Amino acid sequence: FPVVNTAYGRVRGVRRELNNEILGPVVQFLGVPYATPPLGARRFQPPEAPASWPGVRNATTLPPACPQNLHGALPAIMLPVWFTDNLEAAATYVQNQSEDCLYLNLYVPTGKKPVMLFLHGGSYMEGTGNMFDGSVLAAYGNVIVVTLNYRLGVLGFLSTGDQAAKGNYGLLDQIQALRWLSENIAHFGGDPERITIFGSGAGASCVNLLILSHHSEGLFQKAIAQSGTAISSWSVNYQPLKYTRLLAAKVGCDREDSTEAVECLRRKSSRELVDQDVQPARYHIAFGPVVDGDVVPDDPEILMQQGEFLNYDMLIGVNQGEGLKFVEDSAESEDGVSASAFDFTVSNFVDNLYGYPEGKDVLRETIKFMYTDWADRDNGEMRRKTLLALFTDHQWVAPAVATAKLHADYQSPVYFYTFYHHCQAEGRPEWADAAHGDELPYVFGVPMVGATDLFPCNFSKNDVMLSAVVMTYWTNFAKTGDPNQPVPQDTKFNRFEEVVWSKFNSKEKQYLHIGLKPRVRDNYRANKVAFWLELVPHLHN
Amino acid sequence: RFPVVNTAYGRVRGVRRELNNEILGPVVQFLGVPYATPPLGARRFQPPEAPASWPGVRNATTLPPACPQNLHGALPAIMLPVWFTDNLEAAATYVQNQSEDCLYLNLYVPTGKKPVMLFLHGGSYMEGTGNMFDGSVLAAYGNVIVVTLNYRLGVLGFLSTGDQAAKGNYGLLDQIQALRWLSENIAHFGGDPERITIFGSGAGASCVNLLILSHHSEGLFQKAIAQSGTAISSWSVNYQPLKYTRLLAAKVGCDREDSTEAVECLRRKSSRELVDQDVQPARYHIAFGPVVDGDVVPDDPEILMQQGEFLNYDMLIGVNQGEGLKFVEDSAESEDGVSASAFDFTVSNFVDNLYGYPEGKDVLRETIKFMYTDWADRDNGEMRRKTLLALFTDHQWVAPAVATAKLHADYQSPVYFYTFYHHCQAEGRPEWADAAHGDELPYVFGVPMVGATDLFPCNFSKNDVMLSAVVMTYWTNFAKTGDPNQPVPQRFEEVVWSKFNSKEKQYLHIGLKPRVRDNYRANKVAFWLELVPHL
């Protein structure tokens, strides 16, 4: 039970030991506050510094999670596959919901060590940071993995568009946890000048929105964005006042005055606000990051094109097939999806995503022709793989390449990768590969610790080898900034020895094809990526 | 030896010229056999008729005169074959005795009934002759009777006004007359009037397909081989015949408002006055050519095949790798292909003078620019030639060939498809180009089996001789029974040619490494046939 004196008092951890023999013991400080709780009048206000406590504080038990409703109407497509499949197992973690969230979990192993802050969340109104045990990652890579809880949903992202409720309260909590780390990690042994930030899904969009901000000026140095970006359709909210008024009407006080409505919402209880069941438009979000002027000044799209950011390092990537939830109705059919429904599915994809009345018949017919296999036009079974790739390319792959190019034009080291592996789960078909959010088990060393309630995968030796490689690639980035130099790719127990990860250049757009058969490719779907970035903007507008 | 064969109109005497090879037997050549009454006078601009019988024995030993033409004028460069345009001076020695007393017929009888393979020459509709191709090697190797003819070309055989004064299609009516003459007299020479194959290239194939879509040639021939040509191209038929007829007439001597008066005066002028008048059509279009009138081609070459109105002949279509080699001609002597600033210039010009639709060309121009790009190698520059060349090959030749093959197979009829992939090593041709337009003609006629000629000065290696024997076997086998695989055994040994079905679009990859592929340019072909009409 080591005691480490911080700048706000003293805490006490534990010395829990991992189940492996090649991993040393770690010291865990679970439940370290980093902001005064927004229990009362602090709701819909930015966080502040914590209050110092006398004596020594218990830090052993996992902290309570921010209020959320895991059995409501959450956006299903945004969530990772393992979150939706194992919903009952994931609901056990979020049981002690309370507004006294905003705690911090530290996993210190046993020069100053690096720090790796993890921004959780598949959507903007679900999840908690207790699901990810970073003890294995911290011990293997000799880094200090830290996971946090931040306000979610209405409580942390409600905005009206005016000064009454600016919004982005969840983003300010993430910045506050970075400021706390920049001032208190030296005692635990970390280095405040080598702070790495990483996430996945909606957390990855928070990483990119944190980069294009002035509040996070000199807090962290590097960044990782796994299967996420800040220019997707479901990244930022462009209709904040509309969804607030629907919420205000449902609770009971839809006052005309913006200030009056906000004050009433502060009077109501937390559970009443969370369980209101407000549903947004398809492929969008209801409550999320809102452009206000402080955190996100004007627009994520405009911000990167104007070159206004502090030039951080980056490590972007995507998976093979992430639109696995785009094709779900035709998932138990003997032979794929029929041509009657392929046209209807593609047609619906355009109204609720483009919907432009300035010429749509040409746009609808152009993408029907391109996402086809004219050499095997009447296959039928592979129309699923084509429809799955239509959603993956448009929503994930194309924005990731556009972000990598914009971050590499202004000189900044950028590393691109594609994940081509998954574990044989229970309820997933054998034709899909590397669904959304499937890189998390390997980056956190799940196969090296065994099966988990969230991951019922039966990991073989090949899955163990891949995890020891992904963690090595990720950790080397946090140590020096290049996934190759500080640590070699040795078995320590293999085609990973001879491969060198090269930078992503705007004209030589190389990447690393992570998998069981790695290879440094040259261009990821250059035909389909260029279709969405070059041709499509010339069709509707 | 000078054998004599009696026909229905008289007697003719041939020659027994022996070939330069040992594995080929001697052939008998009846050069200059008439098949229509010579239309010198008022018979101009009128359909032909049967010849007049000649008493005694007629001599058929020397090659006949060619129809009037202007081979040193402003001919369509793109339409003509590559071997014709390069050796324009060597090809002009054949067309020297130009006279209106053309419409003769050349026969090459080898040494029970043998098939007949009538060859329809022509790269454009106003040039060429039947003497350029010596079908002695093809006749001796395949044991068939090869026939080459001369028909009226250009103004004298295709001038039309759209009225009854001059219907047009006079050149087409002459080709049918040769078939009618062959179907009525080839029995004496030893041929089989029930197995008459017709084949051609370039503008010969365009009038092969037009002969299928007609009622005049109902029970005359049986099969058809179309090499690099269709009836649905831009330069296949003429849709504005009156505009060019008025342009020609006003240039020569006449601007009479009445159509009949203009036709009568044109008959008064000499043949050389009309031919050498230098009338130029629009780009990728023809000035004097086949025109829809109602007698030969009733309604439209596109409409007729869509309604399934023909007599269900066997067919054999094909194309080459790159035939638009003349499309990329100005930027042919540059260090690094074509510049990206000149790529969208030729594509915009291609859309400008070929579609020209005021219903929105901005979307069409950007779509075909993006389709024909190599984003994996966006900055190659030299490779941009291979995509500009392939843009013209796909639009003009490959897409109509596949559309014609499908439409002739939906209505039950055998169709065979091929793609040529070999060429002769010339002197003025670039090393990267492959199988330009008309580069399959030397192989089908067995030129390498006899040696390089004036028209084809390429140095033919041992592979070219091997390929020519195979190509002449497939063509001969088709003309014998209709199946290029069965009658005569032949990596060509184990290769079998499969029919072209509309859903199983198999073809043959003729070349040094034969294969039976499944979909030729499926992505690009389906772009022109399906997406473009929606744009």
Ligand SMILES: *[C@@H]1O[C@H](CO)[C@@H](O)[C@H](O)[C@H]1NC(C)=O
């Ligand atoms: C820390 O936790 C232990 C629980 O075993 C408790 O006994 C102890 O009093 C705590 N120390 C504090 C609150 O300072």
Ligand SMILES: *[C@@H]1O[C@H](CO)[C@@H](O)[C@H](O)[C@H]1NC(C)=O
């Ligand atoms: C994992 O293995 C156990 C024991 O063999 C089995 O019961 C279970 O179904 C397996 N699960 C998967 C996803 O393969």
Ligand SMILES: *[C@@H]1O[C@H](CO)[C@@H](O)[C@H](O)[C@H]1NC(C)=O
């Ligand atoms: C016919 O041709 C033969 C062979 O060339 C020749 O000997 C004969 O004189 C010719 N007859 C006439 C009338 O020209």
Ligand SMILES: *[C@@H]1O[C@H](CO)[C@@H](O)[C@H](O)[C@H]1NC(C)=O
């Ligand atoms: C033709 O090619 C052969 C084979 O390489 C060579 O021996 C011969 O000299 C060549 N002749 C000419 C005229 O190029």
